Curated annotation (Swiss-Prot):
Keywords: Hydrolase, Metal-binding, mRNA processing, Nuclease, Nucleotide-binding, Nucleus, RNA-binding. It is found in: Nucleus. The keyword Nuclease applies. GO terms for cellular component: cytosol; Las1 complex; nucleus; RNA polymerase II termination complex. It comes from Candida albicans (strain SC5314 / ATCC MYA-2876). The lineage of its organism: Eukaryota, Fungi, Dikarya, Ascomycota, Saccharomycotina. PANTHER family: DECAPPING AND EXORIBONUCLEASE PROTEIN (PTHR12395:SF9), DOM-3 RELATED (PTHR12395). This is Decapping nuclease RAI1.
Amino acid sequence: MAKSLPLNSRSKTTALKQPRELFSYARDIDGKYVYDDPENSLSYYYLPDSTIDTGIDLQGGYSKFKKIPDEQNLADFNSLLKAIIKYETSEGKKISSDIITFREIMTKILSLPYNLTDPIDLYVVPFDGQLFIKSDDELDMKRRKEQEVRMKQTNTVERYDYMKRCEYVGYKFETIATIPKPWSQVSRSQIENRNKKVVNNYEQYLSVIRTGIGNVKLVLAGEIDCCWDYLPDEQNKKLNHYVELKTSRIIENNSQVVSFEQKLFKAWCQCFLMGVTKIIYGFRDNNLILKNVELFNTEEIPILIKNNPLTNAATEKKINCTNALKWYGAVVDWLNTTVDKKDEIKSYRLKYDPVRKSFTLSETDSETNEKLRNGQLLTPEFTEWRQSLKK
């Protein structure tokens, strides 16, 4: 049985906390995490207009694509806690936050209002005065699986192959737009030979930030694509220099104008939540050749969506970013006023049910609440480490 939040809930408040990076960690070419010197894993954006003019083929190398199987690539709470231990150890203290979770989780919530057909299924878990929130993985995988089989069964073999190559365009773009070190420390041939480099999606640089909304405090782990220019030593300045990289088809008609608006909004959700101030889009034609690249400043995106004449639509259907924010804040304040964070015996389920227009918080089963507390979310080491701070 459930508590539910009217989908028309909107905070009035939106006092906004300035995001700040706490630490980072990484994943390597084989899937393994890395807690020491993760900065060695941070690439740097490098893609001069002159080179774009060469007409880079974003499907070069498709065949050799080194791709992590989906099950291995679910947002991993184990490594993150493991990462979190290291940093709290050093601080001599635990992170002040009302919530701790991956940021894709919050992106979905923040973007829900204009993505009303997309389910959301997550677990919520009280522990040490804080809420821990991971995604119902089982469910997720089973959808990706069944969505996969639809796409295969309802399309021609060529249309399916093309969709698969589009998925690769994203990684390939990241590969030919970044360099592993800054410009000063990299050779001219390391630069000119990126287009041959074998593409993988194993390697990741992950940042854990502290942020907040109204009077609630959040910690978000999320992936960062690269650094814009350089990475300052100064802690509270690092987020200002990351870039998100995306790619999109060139825009031909009005139908694509709105499709692009909706992508751009999603991306603004992700980056706003993370404090990433820069979004680059590489626009590629139907032969998956890169045509031009355009940088957006995150904080300007709301203004561009509001003022597009082509996409003036119905108030309830028009993307407004503030209105989503007011929704977001109304969500987290609900999570923050509904669960006794201190009561660490039961867990919950966040469900958004698209068919039933329901946003439900409901207590989980008892085995449920167990396995989350014993290895599925919380780990022996983290649980242990966290208690020993009062002892």
